[PDB]
Amino acid sequence: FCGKGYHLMSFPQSAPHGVVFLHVTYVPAQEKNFTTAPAICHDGKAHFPREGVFVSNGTHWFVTQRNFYEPQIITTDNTFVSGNCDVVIGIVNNTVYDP
Amino acid sequence: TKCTLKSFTVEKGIYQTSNFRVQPTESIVRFPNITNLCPFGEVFNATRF
Amino acid sequence: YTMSLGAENSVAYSNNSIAIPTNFTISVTTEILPVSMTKTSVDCTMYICG
Amino acid sequence: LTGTGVLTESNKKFLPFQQFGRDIADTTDAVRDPQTLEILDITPCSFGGV
Amino acid sequence: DSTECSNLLLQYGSFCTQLNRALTGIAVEQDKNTQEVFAQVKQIYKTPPIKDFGGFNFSQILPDPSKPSKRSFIEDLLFNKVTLADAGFIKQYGDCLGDIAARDLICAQKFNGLTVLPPLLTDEMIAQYTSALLAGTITSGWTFGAGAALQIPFAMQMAYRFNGIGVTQNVLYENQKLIANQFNSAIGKIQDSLSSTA
Ligand SMILES: *[C@@H]1O[C@H](CO)[C@@H](O[C@@H]2O[C@H](CO)[C@@H](O)[C@H](O)[C@H]2NC(C)=O)[C@H](O)[C@H]1NC(C)=O
Ligand SMILES: *[C@@H]1O[C@H](CO)[C@@H](O[C@@H]2O[C@H](CO)[C@@H](O)[C@H](O)[C@H]2NC(C)=O)[C@H](O)[C@H]1NC(C)=O
Ligand SMILES: *[C@@H]1O[C@H](CO)[C@@H](O[C@@H]2O[C@H](CO)[C@@H](O)[C@H](O)[C@H]2NC(C)=O)[C@H](O)[C@H]1NC(C)=O
Ligand SMILES: *[C@@H]1O[C@H](CO)[C@@H](O[C@@H]2O[C@H](CO)[C@@H](O)[C@H](O)[C@H]2NC(C)=O)[C@H](O)[C@H]1NC(C)=O
Ligand SMILES: *[C@@H]1O[C@H](CO)[C@@H](O[C@@H]2O[C@H](CO)[C@@H](O)[C@H](O)[C@H]2NC(C)=O)[C@H](O)[C@H]1NC(C)=O
Ligand SMILES: *[C@@H]1O[C@H](CO)[C@@H](O)[C@H](O)[C@H]1NC(C)=O
Ligand SMILES: *[C@@H]1O[C@H](CO)[C@@H](O)[C@H](O)[C@H]1NC(C)=O
Ligand SMILES: *[C@@H]1O[C@H](CO)[C@@H](O)[C@H](O)[C@H]1NC(C)=O
Numbered sequence A: 001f002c003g004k005g006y007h008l009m010s011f012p013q014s015a016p017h018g019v020v021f022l023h024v025t026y027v028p029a030q031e032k033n034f035t036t037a038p039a040i041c042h043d044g045k046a047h048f049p050r051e052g053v054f055v056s057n058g059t060h061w062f063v064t065q066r067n068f069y070e071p072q073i074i075t076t077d078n079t080f081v082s083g084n085c086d087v088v089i090g091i092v093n094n095t096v097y098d099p
Numbered sequence B: 001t002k003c004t005l006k007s008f009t010v011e012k013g014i015y016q017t018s019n020f021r022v023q024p025t026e027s028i029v030r031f032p033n034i035t036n037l038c039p040f041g042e043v044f045n046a047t048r049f
Numbered sequence C: 001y002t003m004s005l006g007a008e009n010s011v012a013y014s015n016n017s018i019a020i021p022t023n024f025t026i027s028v029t030t031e032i033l034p035v036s037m038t039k040t041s042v043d044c045t046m047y048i049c050g
Numbered sequence D: 001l002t003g004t005g006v007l008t009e010s011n012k013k014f015l016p017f018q019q020f021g022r023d024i025a026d027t028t029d030a031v032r033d034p035q036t037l038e039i040l041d042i043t044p045c046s047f048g049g050v
Numbered sequence E: 001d002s003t004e005c006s007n008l009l010l011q012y013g014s015f016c017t018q019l020n021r022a023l024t025g026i027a028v029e030q031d032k033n034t035q036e037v038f039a040q041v042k043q044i045y046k047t048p049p050i051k052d053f054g055g056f057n058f059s060q061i062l063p064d065p066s067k068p069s070k071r072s073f074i075e076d077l078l079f080n081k082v083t084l085a086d087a088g089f090i091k092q093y094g095d096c097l098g099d100i101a102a103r104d105l106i107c108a109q110k111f112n113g114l115t116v117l118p119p120l121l122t123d124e125m126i127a128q129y130t131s132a133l134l135a136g137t138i139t140s141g142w143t144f145g146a147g148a149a150l151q152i153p154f155a156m157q158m159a160y161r162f163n164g165i166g167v168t169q170n171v172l173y174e175n176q177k178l179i180a181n182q183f184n185s186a187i188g189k190i191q192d193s194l195s196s197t198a
């Protein structure tokens, strides 16, 4: 609607019989593949991400926001628990570290 | 404005009005300086056509 | 020529794979949009009579 | 050529075989006066820009 | 068939030229309408082979590569339902009234000058835009036109879209099979409704 990428700002400028918008937008680049999971079964209970997604680098699991790779250690503050892990399809086994 | 809108009540705003204000009172005729009469006697009253 | 529909590229879909960016660019683009046109009117007495 | 309007002095130049002037081709603007050979341009009496 | 066609053109040509400039502006407006509806994102994504859509059966809207046409099943039903010029006017016109992509010069003669201009976007190019929109949507979600489409599993996109309506992801991930079955049943009821000739 207001430029390619994620919109941030738009600056109007007057123009002969019109207006010119200077759209300042966020264009992502240098993407990386990651092995992702919907939830994590720890201690017999499923942990779902409060914000972001569960991805893995090598054999270590982190939670990151979707639009930028910021690896954060999986924490009980970062996740929420709902039910058991027998019902979630695609759940992986990992530990949820507590502060 | 009333004659342009064909109504005795006009509303608030601007209105473009056609000309009714000026009427010509004098007429001028300008012809070339010609004195002699045309020879229609030669054309019309010739002995033989 | 034929009209270009867009940039040809492919994306690899998998049930356990995601793509997350590691960098970004801040891009300023210009979009030009007309707002008004030339306001014109006709004068009736000059148009009809002259 | 009969009409109703106002005349001004014009800076136009006429060829010797030309008598009337029509830049818009539906209104006679410039004319050559028959007695004095000055060229007078005719604008309408109606000031409709009101 | 006038003998004095040049004089008739000199006396009445600019009137028809203005009217034809109005009709051409209308036709260009129709082309801009088609572009602003279908060509919002000018990126063409190839249709993926059907592989792990989370139980969501998209085969009726996502087009098959086996057919020579780019259309899908539901699209085929939509174009088969609306026959062009299937109206009383067809008997007099001979289908000259609408674009069959085969209209010939004889139709202009029948309509006294009136011609039907073909659209700028071929129905193949509209079906390709629709297929690119579908493939990009299913594969990526919101990152489609943001540039650099970022692959994501469809279940996680559905979890994010439940987060959009204020429902936690556990509702989806506990009831994924039920939601997929409901979606497939709704798609089947739409197909049967389009196939019912109503
Ligand atoms: C994935 O990335 C994380 C974060 O960089 C790695 O975790 C750290 O890696 C460094 C270098 O290997 C170690 O010195 C730290 O002790 C690690 N800390 C943690 C959180 O364990 C992680 O090793 C990477 N995994 C793989 C296998 O690539
Ligand atoms: C996650 O770990 C649990 C054990 O903590 C696994 O559950 C066991 O899996 C083995 C092999 O399938 C079975 O023989 C046991 O009967 C299971 N025990 C339980 C507690 O159910 C579970 O399969 C692992 N899941 C993943 C994704 O690897
Ligand atoms: C992301 O890309 C930007 C450029 O778009 C990189 O910025 C450059 O950083 C290097 C090293 O610090 C400088 O030498 C360049 O002058 C910078 N260029 C610009 C455009 O400012 C940035 O480092 C990249 N980040 C990653 C992680 O690749
Ligand atoms: C999605 O549903 C369609 C039907 O709407 C499935 O197509 C059927 O495939 C089966 C064989 O598996 C045939 O017996 C049917 O006759 C097919 N119907 C039609 C009209 O094609 C399609 O296989 C389903 N997709 C998946 C993978 O579940
Ligand atoms: C909510 O309603 C849905 C149907 O809209 C129920 O789903 C059915 O569940 C029963 C029992 O598990 C199954 O026999 C049916 O096959 C399901 N139907 C569908 C469409 O999948 C669901 O159980 C209801 N939930 C509650 C708590 O009432
Ligand atoms: C991600 O994986 C696909 C297929 O495995 C590959 O085509 C693509 O280049 C990969 N991207 C990165 C950034 O590794
Ligand atoms: C992804 O697909 C592969 C191949 O069908 C399958 O083995 C795997 O279990 C699937 N994973 C999930 C989470 O659906
Ligand atoms: C036309 O000629 C006749 C013959 O001389 C003459 O009697 C008459 O007056 C003339 N009429 C005019 C108008 O000159």
Ligand SMILES: *[C@@H]1O[C@H](CO)[C@@H](O)[C@H](O)[C@H]1NC(C)=O
Residues within 6 Å of the ligand: B033, D035, D036
């Ligand atoms: C026309 O004749 C009048 C009367 O003698 C004279 O005043 C005027 O100058 C003449 N105009 C010419 C010769 O252009």
